[PDB]
Each structure stands twice: as structure tokens, then as C-alpha cells.
Design a protein around this ligand. Structure first.
Ligand SMILES: Nc1ncnc2c1ncn2[C@@H]1O[C@H](COP(=O)(O)OP(=O)(O)NP(=O)(O)O)[C@@H](O)[C@H]1O
Lengths: 51, 51, 51
């Protein structure tokens, strides 16, 4: 109910070790450790900026 | 400097090195799922259940 | 058989320079089959690559 009232425009550039589960390539099955190590986005800034 | 070497793997090592492509999520995670009538929050490893 | 570069990239699948190491590659390609998939479902095709 919190996250149901948002539209999100997320563009990520220059990532490594991407893994998608299909030739359709529509969704990422990469492990969360590599994505969390690559992403240095301050999500708490987004939380205080939409709070 | 980053290292660019093209490697070609056999299918046993392709499965054993890229395990998220073929058995799904390979980490101990939590899900809200149906069990015996109850939608409950429980924690497990999905790969053994998938196999 | 000795097949040159762009024609093997565009007609025969499992061909590409995206089969390298996952720790260095920033491109999203992992198949080698894509321009063959484009060319197979086309009744006319011309393609020029100048190097
Ligand atoms: N027009 C082109 N320009 C550049 N590279 C090309 C072109 N056509 C074919 N290729 C090469 O051949 C491959 C095309 O097949 P494709 O299935 O797209 O491979 P991929 O890029 O490894 N995988 P994916 O993009 O996820 O489908 C690419 O990886 C390129 O290296």
C-alpha cells in the first residue's frame, strides 16, 4: 500500500556482470551483492525527498 | 587496468559457475507463501526445492 | 569453413564479441544469435560495414 502509489523513472549506467534469465531479457537475475556493490545511490535522500 | 579475456566454458562448468541462470535464486531468502492453508512468512533456500 | 566478420555476425548465430569475461563487460549482450534472428525474419536485407 505504500509502494503502490508511485511511478519510478530509473536509469542506471555503467554496470557490470549483468544476468538475465531469458532471451526475452525482460528481467534481471543478477545476484544482489554485485548490484549493491555497484550502486552508490543514496536512497535515503529519495526517502526524505518524497516524505 | 581491467582485464578483458574471452573465456568459453563447457556446460557443466557453465551451470556450476552461473548457477543463478538455471536454478533461480540460490540464496537463503524469505517469502510470504501458502503452506497448508496459511499465508505465512518463512525463510529457506529455493534451489533444493527447485531440484 | 572460413567466413568473414560481418556476414558471420549477421547470418550465423552464436557469433559475437560479447562472449568475454563478466567482470569487465559493460555491454548487455550474451547470446551471439541476434542479427541472425533479425536476418532470418527478413525477406530483403542489405547491410554495410566499413572498417
Ligand atoms: N550490427 C552489428 N553491430 C555490432 N555487432 C554486431 C552487429 N550484428 C551482430 N553483431 C555481433 O554479433 C552479436 C549479435 O548477436 P546477439 O544475440 O545480439 O549477441 P549478444 O549481443 O552477445 N546477445 P544479446 O544482445 O543479449 O541478444 C553481438 O554480440 C555482436 O558482437
Amino acid at each position: 500500500r505504500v509502494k503502490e502509489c508511485l511511478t519510478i523513472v530509473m536509469f542506471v549506467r555503467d554496470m557490470k556482470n549483468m544476468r538475465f534469465d531469458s532471451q526475452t531479457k525482460e528481467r534481471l537475475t543478477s545476484p544482489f551483492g554485485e548490484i549493491r556493490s555497484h550502486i552508490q545511490l543514496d536512497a535515503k535522500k529519495i526517502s526524505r525527498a518524497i516524505l | 587496468m581491467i582485464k578483458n579475456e574471452i573465456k568459453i566454458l563447457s556446460d557443466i562448468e557453465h551451470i556450476k559457475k552461473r548457477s543463478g541462470m538455471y536454478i533461480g535464486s540460490s540464496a537463503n531468502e524469505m517469502h510470504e507463501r501458502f503452506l497448508f492453508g496459511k499465508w505465512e512468512s518463512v525463510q529457506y533456500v529455493p534451489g533444493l526445492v527447485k531440484l | 569453413e572460413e567466413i568473414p566478420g560481418p556476414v558471420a555476425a549477421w547470418t550465423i548465430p552464436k557469433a559475437g564479441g560479447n562472449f568475454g569475461d563478466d567482470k569487465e563487460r559493460v555491454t548487455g549482450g550474451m547470446n551471439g544469435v541476434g542479427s541472425s534472428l533479425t536476418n532470418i525474419f527478413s525477406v530483403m536485407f542489405v547491410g554495410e560495414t566499413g572498417d
